[PDB]
Amino acid sequence: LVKVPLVRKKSLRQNLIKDGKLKDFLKTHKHNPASKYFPEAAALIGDEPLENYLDTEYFGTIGIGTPAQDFTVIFDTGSSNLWVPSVYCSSLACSDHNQFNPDDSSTFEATSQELSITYGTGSMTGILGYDTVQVGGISDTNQIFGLSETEPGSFLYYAPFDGILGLAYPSISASGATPVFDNLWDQGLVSQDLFSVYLSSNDDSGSVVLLGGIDSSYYTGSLNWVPVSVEGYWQITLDSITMDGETIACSGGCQAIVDTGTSLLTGPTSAIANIQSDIGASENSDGEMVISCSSIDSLPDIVFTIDGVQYPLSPSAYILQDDDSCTSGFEGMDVPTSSGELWILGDVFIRQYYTVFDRANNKVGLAPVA
Amino acid sequence: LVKVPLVRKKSLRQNLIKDGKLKDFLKTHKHNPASKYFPEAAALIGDEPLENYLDTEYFGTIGIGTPAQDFTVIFDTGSSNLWVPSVYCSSLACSDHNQFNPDDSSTFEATSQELSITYGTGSMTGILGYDTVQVGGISDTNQIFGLSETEPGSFLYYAPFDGILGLAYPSISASGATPVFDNLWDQGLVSQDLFSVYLSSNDDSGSVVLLGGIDSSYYTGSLNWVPVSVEGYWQITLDSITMDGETIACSGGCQAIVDTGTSLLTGPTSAIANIQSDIGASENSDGEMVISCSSIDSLPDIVFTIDGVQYPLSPSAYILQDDDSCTSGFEGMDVPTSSGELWILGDVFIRQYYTVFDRANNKVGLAPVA
């Protein structure tokens, strides 16, 4: 099977905290994760184009060119472009990162098409080029990708990743560059038009992106299939959210986006504040909603109901445990008033439920991890 | 007299060259100095807001707050705002720079007015505040200034200055913040509504910004007064430019801007290419138009005719000599097609001609340095 191993690393947020750089950032900027999903919510001050990747924790490796140049990338179901830093990226933030040198690859083909990539909090520009991308042992020929050249914001310097590899639909791809998965399928390089993600528990190694297959070894029970409600992001319909039997959000149903680019459950500010207080989370000096590790066993499960099946999350799942340091896996966002209630199901969710992304039938399948 | 001593330091360009960072920049950006003077010429890619300060060489010191916090600033006749980096500037580029901490000053007064400063190649944002600025021994009370908070571009990291102090008319001041000189005069803190600049020869110390006075010790002969042709920048009318008796540019007259924020004579691309070839200048791998130091004595003078008086520049004046390394003091620019021929008279010019900036009568006075 084609497997891309994923490694769990300390997030960009954890690195900013460690370098004492986060408090200042937060003082002068308002962080709203909703900006990654809605044009309307784009950041007032776009000087940190990678702000929406503060909480990413899993990364994989890809090689580009002939011979291959390696890069650490985020496998992001919440975006659809592939980009890595160009060797022409002179920014201080590009230092200490793997950079692509087009002149070292005999299969690289330049284009004069400009790339403008934005995740709702500023843009990065570069150029589009074509090369062979090595992903999971497959040689993805003639893959169009972006080469980032302009200032990427100081956050790149502290990021454990060099670029991003988008797994969403082509309709949200910047400059209509073809996404990697689409290119794989169009070329007959994968068995089926689907991919699955398995995240191992407790920062273990064993996590993988499975391209073109479903592996019964990673789940128990049967897979529940849910239709994609709006094609763009991997968006589905949620029936309700309960805590201790009580409905606490998504009353009457709501939308949810499955996003591997974030480790947290993100929802409306008000619903989230309720939950944080209920679980005893408290914001420290840095951004952090800390919780006592010792109180975990006293918390209730949060239950997501999807297509009539119940998906409970126990406290051990929704509380991030960094040796003796525990943080809440919930984060709030403000979506356009236009927009209905929206929840983001990130790694906390996926680590408990093996997920299948079916492009042939436009459905998401879920089952409890084995 | 109120004198602000100026020190000649290696430029930002020299520092980028030294750190091997310039070739890449130039590969991905087109540098057009005209962007500092015309909205219409603003940069396609604004990721380096301080690009137009690559060639600045003279700097002074100012203190801000109670007790004073010191900063190295450019005294720029080509701009009108005063700004320094805020302690809240978290960017990697803000490191190693003096930063203003509002909480350390008992006379600081915050405003909720945002500052957007641009010199034609990207913006920096922050907030406007009021404090006492110490300039040349004078206590400039209730001075409004900007506190830069967002990414300033990687160039700030290599810049020998922390901020900029604009000496142009208020009509080009961003956010209508009052310029320092205007504030000085409005408060009766200077003798007269004028200032003069004396640049000593051969990177000597002795250079000064003279606030409210004219000192006959710095020039010989009489001062020639020229009216400001358009109030905004210190803009005057040029009658012609000759080289070896031949008219080489500004035939029939043209405009000139006196700009202490740059060390070079800047003019139309075509006229400049002609001159570079005539003097034997050649662009090296870095941006640089190098000239053999040994050929100086064989070059002709370039003559600027202003209000009928001749202002010759000998080769020793128009050739920058950095120990055994000589560079051409000419640089080209592309002004809006709308616009007529425009020349920028920077430090090469001012080092030979003591300059007086008269705000009371809207005139510029010139005389050969003593």
PDB file of all heavy atoms in Angstrom, chain A residues 301-323:
ATOM      1  N   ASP A 301     -17.394  13.357  28.844  1.00  0.00           N
ATOM      2  CA  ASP A 301     -17.070  13.189  27.409  1.00  0.00           C
ATOM      3  C   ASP A 301     -17.955  14.216  26.714  1.00  0.00           C
ATOM      4  O   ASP A 301     -18.992  14.626  27.232  1.00  0.00           O
ATOM      5  CB  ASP A 301     -17.624  11.843  26.925  1.00  0.00           C
ATOM      6  CG  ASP A 301     -16.873  10.606  27.372  1.00  0.00           C
ATOM      7  OD1 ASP A 301     -15.873  10.736  28.106  1.00  0.00           O
ATOM      8  OD2 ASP A 301     -17.293   9.490  26.978  1.00  0.00           O
ATOM      9  N   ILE A 302     -17.564  14.597  25.527  1.00  0.00           N
ATOM     10  CA  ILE A 302     -18.208  15.514  24.609  1.00  0.00           C
ATOM     11  C   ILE A 302     -18.581  14.513  23.466  1.00  0.00           C
ATOM     12  O   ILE A 302     -17.715  13.692  23.124  1.00  0.00           O
ATOM     13  CB  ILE A 302     -17.371  16.726  24.155  1.00  0.00           C
ATOM     14  CG1 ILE A 302     -18.221  17.541  23.139  1.00  0.00           C
ATOM     15  CG2 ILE A 302     -16.038  16.220  23.544  1.00  0.00           C
ATOM     16  CD1 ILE A 302     -17.649  18.995  22.958  1.00  0.00           C
ATOM     17  N   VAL A 303     -19.796  14.598  23.028  1.00  0.00           N
ATOM     18  CA  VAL A 303     -20.296  13.702  21.973  1.00  0.00           C
ATOM     19  C   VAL A 303     -20.749  14.437  20.730  1.00  0.00           C
ATOM     20  O   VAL A 303     -21.599  15.334  20.742  1.00  0.00           O
ATOM     21  CB  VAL A 303     -21.402  12.793  22.546  1.00  0.00           C
ATOM     22  CG1 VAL A 303     -21.831  11.693  21.542  1.00  0.00           C
ATOM     23  CG2 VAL A 303     -20.932  12.237  23.876  1.00  0.00           C
ATOM     24  N   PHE A 304     -20.147  14.013  19.584  1.00  0.00           N
ATOM     25  CA  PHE A 304     -20.510  14.600  18.274  1.00  0.00           C
ATOM     26  C   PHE A 304     -21.435  13.559  17.625  1.00  0.00           C
ATOM     27  O   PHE A 304     -21.013  12.403  17.660  1.00  0.00           O
ATOM     28  CB  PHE A 304     -19.357  14.845  17.311  1.00  0.00           C
ATOM     29  CG  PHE A 304     -18.464  15.946  17.852  1.00  0.00           C
ATOM     30  CD1 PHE A 304     -17.579  15.684  18.883  1.00  0.00           C
ATOM     31  CD2 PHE A 304     -18.520  17.224  17.323  1.00  0.00           C
ATOM     32  CE1 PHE A 304     -16.741  16.651  19.405  1.00  0.00           C
ATOM     33  CE2 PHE A 304     -17.700  18.252  17.807  1.00  0.00           C
ATOM     34  CZ  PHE A 304     -16.814  17.933  18.853  1.00  0.00           C
ATOM     35  N   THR A 305     -22.550  13.959  17.108  1.00  0.00           N
ATOM     36  CA  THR A 305     -23.515  13.061  16.470  1.00  0.00           C
ATOM     37  C   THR A 305     -23.437  13.444  14.988  1.00  0.00           C
ATOM     38  O   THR A 305     -23.681  14.592  14.635  1.00  0.00           O
ATOM     39  CB  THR A 305     -24.990  13.028  17.037  1.00  0.00           C
ATOM     40  OG1 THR A 305     -24.874  12.638  18.453  1.00  0.00           O
ATOM     41  CG2 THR A 305     -25.932  12.118  16.237  1.00  0.00           C
ATOM     42  N   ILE A 306     -23.066  12.391  14.244  1.00  0.00           N
ATOM     43  CA  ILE A 306     -22.921  12.548  12.796  1.00  0.00           C
ATOM     44  C   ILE A 306     -23.699  11.431  12.033  1.00  0.00           C
ATOM     45  O   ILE A 306     -23.385  10.241  12.275  1.00  0.00           O
ATOM     46  CB  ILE A 306     -21.425  12.489  12.340  1.00  0.00           C
ATOM     47  CG1 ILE A 306     -20.464  13.441  13.081  1.00  0.00           C
ATOM     48  CG2 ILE A 306     -21.405  12.739  10.794  1.00  0.00           C
ATOM     49  CD1 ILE A 306     -18.933  13.202  12.875  1.00  0.00           C
ATOM     50  N   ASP A 307     -24.606  11.952  11.250  1.00  0.00           N
ATOM     51  CA  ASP A 307     -25.441  11.015  10.456  1.00  0.00           C
ATOM     52  C   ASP A 307     -26.005   9.917  11.356  1.00  0.00           C
ATOM     53  O   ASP A 307     -26.043   8.718  11.057  1.00  0.00           O
ATOM     54  CB  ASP A 307     -24.645  10.540   9.253  1.00  0.00           C
ATOM     55  CG  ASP A 307     -25.551   9.820   8.252  1.00  0.00           C
ATOM     56  OD1 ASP A 307     -26.644  10.335   7.946  1.00  0.00           O
ATOM     57  OD2 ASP A 307     -25.051   8.737   7.845  1.00  0.00           O
ATOM     58  N   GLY A 308     -26.460  10.343  12.524  1.00  0.00           N
ATOM     59  CA  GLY A 308     -27.061   9.520  13.542  1.00  0.00           C
ATOM     60  C   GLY A 308     -26.218   8.613  14.397  1.00  0.00           C
ATOM     61  O   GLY A 308     -26.757   7.940  15.286  1.00  0.00           O
ATOM     62  N   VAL A 309     -24.931   8.598  14.136  1.00  0.00           N
ATOM     63  CA  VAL A 309     -24.061   7.738  14.932  1.00  0.00           C
ATOM     64  C   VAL A 309     -23.367   8.674  15.947  1.00  0.00           C
ATOM     65  O   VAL A 309     -23.076   9.813  15.592  1.00  0.00           O
ATOM     66  CB  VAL A 309     -23.057   7.027  14.014  1.00  0.00           C
ATOM     67  CG1 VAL A 309     -22.012   6.319  14.847  1.00  0.00           C
ATOM     68  CG2 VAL A 309     -23.838   6.181  12.996  1.00  0.00           C
ATOM     69  N   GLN A 310     -23.126   8.161  17.109  1.00  0.00           N
ATOM     70  CA  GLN A 310     -22.463   8.941  18.161  1.00  0.00           C
ATOM     71  C   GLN A 310     -20.953   8.755  18.178  1.00  0.00           C
ATOM     72  O   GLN A 310     -20.423   7.637  18.128  1.00  0.00           O
ATOM     73  CB  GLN A 310     -22.985   8.600  19.573  1.00  0.00           C
ATOM     74  CG  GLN A 310     -24.359   9.241  19.528  1.00  0.00           C
ATOM     75  CD  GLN A 310     -25.230   9.121  20.738  1.00  0.00           C
ATOM     76  OE1 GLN A 310     -26.424   9.300  20.452  1.00  0.00           O
ATOM     77  NE2 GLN A 310     -24.662   8.860  21.908  1.00  0.00           N
ATOM     78  N   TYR A 311     -20.294   9.896  18.244  1.00  0.00           N
ATOM     79  CA  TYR A 311     -18.842   9.928  18.290  1.00  0.00           C
ATOM     80  C   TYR A 311     -18.356  10.639  19.575  1.00  0.00           C
ATOM     81  O   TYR A 311     -18.072  11.830  19.469  1.00  0.00           O
ATOM     82  CB  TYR A 311     -18.153  10.598  17.043  1.00  0.00           C
ATOM     83  CG  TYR A 311     -18.503   9.845  15.764  1.00  0.00           C
ATOM     84  CD1 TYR A 311     -19.695  10.018  15.091  1.00  0.00           C
ATOM     85  CD2 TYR A 311     -17.610   8.905  15.246  1.00  0.00           C
ATOM     86  CE1 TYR A 311     -20.036   9.311  13.933  1.00  0.00           C
ATOM     87  CE2 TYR A 311     -17.897   8.170  14.097  1.00  0.00           C
ATOM     88  CZ  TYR A 311     -19.108   8.385  13.449  1.00  0.00           C
ATOM     89  OH  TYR A 311     -19.434   7.674  12.306  1.00  0.00           O
ATOM     90  N   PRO A 312     -18.248   9.899  20.630  1.00  0.00           N
ATOM     91  CA  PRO A 312     -17.753  10.485  21.887  1.00  0.00           C
ATOM     92  C   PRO A 312     -16.243  10.690  21.865  1.00  0.00           C
ATOM     93  O   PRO A 312     -15.386   9.987  21.263  1.00  0.00           O
ATOM     94  CB  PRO A 312     -18.071   9.394  22.917  1.00  0.00           C
ATOM     95  CG  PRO A 312     -17.988   8.103  22.108  1.00  0.00           C
ATOM     96  CD  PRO A 312     -18.595   8.462  20.764  1.00  0.00           C
ATOM     97  N   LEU A 313     -15.770  11.722  22.553  1.00  0.00           N
ATOM     98  CA  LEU A 313     -14.410  12.158  22.802  1.00  0.00           C
ATOM     99  C   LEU A 313     -14.285  12.172  24.342  1.00  0.00           C
ATOM    100  O   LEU A 313     -15.066  12.921  24.975  1.00  0.00           O
ATOM    101  CB  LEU A 313     -14.092  13.497  22.167  1.00  0.00           C
ATOM    102  CG  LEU A 313     -13.984  13.522  20.636  1.00  0.00           C
ATOM    103  CD1 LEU A 313     -13.475  14.920  20.283  1.00  0.00           C
ATOM    104  CD2 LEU A 313     -12.997  12.467  20.147  1.00  0.00           C
ATOM    105  N   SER A 314     -13.404  11.386  24.885  1.00  0.00           N
ATOM    106  CA  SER A 314     -13.238  11.342  26.346  1.00  0.00           C
ATOM    107  C   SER A 314     -12.214  12.425  26.675  1.00  0.00           C
ATOM    108  O   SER A 314     -11.489  12.885  25.777  1.00  0.00           O
ATOM    109  CB  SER A 314     -12.660   9.984  26.714  1.00  0.00           C
ATOM    110  OG  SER A 314     -11.311   9.955  26.237  1.00  0.00           O
ATOM    111  N   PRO A 315     -12.158  12.818  27.938  1.00  0.00           N
ATOM    112  CA  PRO A 315     -11.182  13.847  28.344  1.00  0.00           C
ATOM    113  C   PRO A 315      -9.735  13.582  27.930  1.00  0.00           C
ATOM    114  O   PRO A 315      -8.967  14.486  27.540  1.00  0.00           O
ATOM    115  CB  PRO A 315     -11.288  13.745  29.875  1.00  0.00           C
ATOM    116  CG  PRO A 315     -12.662  13.256  30.161  1.00  0.00           C
ATOM    117  CD  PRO A 315     -13.025  12.301  29.027  1.00  0.00           C
ATOM    118  N   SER A 316      -9.283  12.336  27.997  1.00  0.00           N
ATOM    119  CA  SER A 316      -7.910  11.946  27.613  1.00  0.00           C
ATOM    120  C   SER A 316      -7.712  12.353  26.136  1.00  0.00           C
ATOM    121  O   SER A 316      -6.595  12.755  25.737  1.00  0.00           O
ATOM    122  CB  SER A 316      -7.675  10.477  27.896  1.00  0.00           C
ATOM    123  OG  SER A 316      -8.738   9.755  27.236  1.00  0.00           O
ATOM    124  N   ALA A 317      -8.768  12.294  25.323  1.00  0.00           N
ATOM    125  CA  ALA A 317      -8.690  12.686  23.903  1.00  0.00           C
ATOM    126  C   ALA A 317      -8.702  14.178  23.610  1.00  0.00           C
ATOM    127  O   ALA A 317      -8.000  14.737  22.741  1.00  0.00           O
ATOM    128  CB  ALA A 317      -9.967  12.108  23.251  1.00  0.00           C
ATOM    129  N   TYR A 318      -9.576  14.909  24.361  1.00  0.00           N
ATOM    130  CA  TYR A 318      -9.697  16.351  24.162  1.00  0.00           C
ATOM    131  C   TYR A 318      -8.737  17.219  24.977  1.00  0.00           C
ATOM    132  O   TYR A 318      -8.738  18.430  24.724  1.00  0.00           O
ATOM    133  CB  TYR A 318     -11.133  16.825  24.104  1.00  0.00           C
ATOM    134  CG  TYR A 318     -11.870  16.775  25.425  1.00  0.00           C
ATOM    135  CD1 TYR A 318     -11.510  17.662  26.469  1.00  0.00           C
ATOM    136  CD2 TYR A 318     -12.925  15.880  25.572  1.00  0.00           C
ATOM    137  CE1 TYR A 318     -12.249  17.592  27.661  1.00  0.00           C
ATOM    138  CE2 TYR A 318     -13.652  15.828  26.764  1.00  0.00           C
ATOM    139  CZ  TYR A 318     -13.294  16.706  27.799  1.00  0.00           C
ATOM    140  OH  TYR A 318     -13.992  16.642  28.965  1.00  0.00           O
ATOM    141  N   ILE A 319      -7.945  16.676  25.833  1.00  0.00           N
ATOM    142  CA  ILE A 319      -6.931  17.338  26.631  1.00  0.00           C
ATOM    143  C   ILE A 319      -5.547  16.942  26.075  1.00  0.00           C
ATOM    144  O   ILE A 319      -5.285  15.745  26.081  1.00  0.00           O
ATOM    145  CB  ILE A 319      -6.980  17.088  28.204  1.00  0.00           C
ATOM    146  CG1 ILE A 319      -8.385  17.483  28.746  1.00  0.00           C
ATOM    147  CG2 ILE A 319      -5.715  17.685  28.871  1.00  0.00           C
ATOM    148  CD1 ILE A 319      -8.901  18.885  28.330  1.00  0.00           C
ATOM    149  N   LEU A 320      -4.721  17.851  25.608  1.00  0.00           N
ATOM    150  CA  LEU A 320      -3.376  17.605  25.084  1.00  0.00           C
ATOM    151  C   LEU A 320      -2.428  17.499  26.287  1.00  0.00           C
ATOM    152  O   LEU A 320      -2.320  18.423  27.104  1.00  0.00           O
ATOM    153  CB  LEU A 320      -3.031  18.683  24.062  1.00  0.00           C
ATOM    154  CG  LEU A 320      -4.079  19.095  23.044  1.00  0.00           C
ATOM    155  CD1 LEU A 320      -3.457  19.655  21.775  1.00  0.00           C
ATOM    156  CD2 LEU A 320      -4.960  17.925  22.635  1.00  0.00           C
ATOM    157  N   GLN A 321      -1.740  16.375  26.420  1.00  0.00           N
ATOM    158  CA  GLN A 321      -0.828  16.171  27.560  1.00  0.00           C
ATOM    159  C   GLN A 321       0.630  16.187  27.101  1.00  0.00           C
ATOM    160  O   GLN A 321       1.066  15.231  26.434  1.00  0.00           O
ATOM    161  CB  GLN A 321      -1.119  14.937  28.407  1.00  0.00           C
ATOM    162  CG  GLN A 321      -0.078  14.962  29.541  1.00  0.00           C
ATOM    163  CD  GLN A 321      -0.456  14.049  30.685  1.00  0.00           C
ATOM    164  OE1 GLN A 321      -1.430  13.294  30.583  1.00  0.00           O
ATOM    165  NE2 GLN A 321       0.342  14.141  31.750  1.00  0.00           N
ATOM    166  N   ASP A 322       1.270  17.276  27.484  1.00  0.00           N
ATOM    167  CA  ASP A 322       2.690  17.531  27.174  1.00  0.00           C
ATOM    168  C   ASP A 322       3.289  17.374  28.587  1.00  0.00           C
ATOM    169  O   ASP A 322       3.112  18.291  29.399  1.00  0.00           O
ATOM    170  CB  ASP A 322       3.034  18.863  26.532  1.00  0.00           C
ATOM    171  CG  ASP A 322       4.538  19.069  26.739  1.00  0.00           C
ATOM    172  OD1 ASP A 322       5.317  18.112  26.535  1.00  0.00           O
ATOM    173  OD2 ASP A 322       4.856  20.221  27.120  1.00  0.00           O
ATOM    174  N   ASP A 323       3.923  16.242  28.780  1.00  0.00           N
ATOM    175  CA  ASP A 323       4.518  15.910  30.057  1.00  0.00           C
ATOM    176  C   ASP A 323       4.238  16.945  31.160  1.00  0.00           C
ATOM    177  O   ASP A 323       4.833  18.044  31.176  1.00  0.00           O
ATOM    178  CB  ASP A 323       6.014  15.565  30.105  1.00  0.00           C
ATOM    179  CG  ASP A 323       6.154  14.346  31.019  1.00  0.00           C
ATOM    180  OD1 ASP A 323       5.223  14.079  31.814  1.00  0.00           O
ATOM    181  OD2 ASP A 323       7.155  13.618  30.980  1.00  0.00           O
TER     182      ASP A 323
END
